[PDB]
Amino acid sequence: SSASSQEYMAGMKNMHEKMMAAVNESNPDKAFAKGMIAHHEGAIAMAETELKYGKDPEMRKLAQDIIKAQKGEIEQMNKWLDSHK
């Protein structure tokens, strides 16, 4: 019922819907690509929520590292999907 828990669930919903679409890919490489994008966007969403509501400095710093790390992997992946269909 809290705002942080409400924000975690909204991020999960978005990740879940995109994850199901990825499982619906017959090409396993396209499923992996689609899947990992939804995974990375979910981790950015969890980390942004942790940076907004979390109070532990160890978790807060881990969340910042995650936001930076998950962007470079989405980059190459979007290209692979855009150059295959």
Does 20 participate in binding Cu ion (rule CB under 5 A)?
A: yes
Does 2 participate in binding its own copies (rule CB under 8 A)?
A: yes
Does 41 participate in binding its own copies (rule CB under 8 A)?
A: no
Q: Report the nearest approach of its own copies to the CB of residue 6 (Å).
A: 9
Q: What share of the chain is helix, strand, coil (3-state, %, to 5)?
A: 85, 0, 15
**Total residue count of the chain as it appears in this document:** 85
Task: State the Cα–Cα distance between residues 33 and 23, nearest whole angstrom.
Answer: 11
Does 59 participate in binding Cu ion (rule CB under 5 A)?
A: no
Task: Mark residues 56-85: x for contact with its own copies by CB under 8 A, - for none.
Answer: x-xxx-xx--x------x--xx--x---x-
| Chain Cα centroid distance, residue 57 | 22
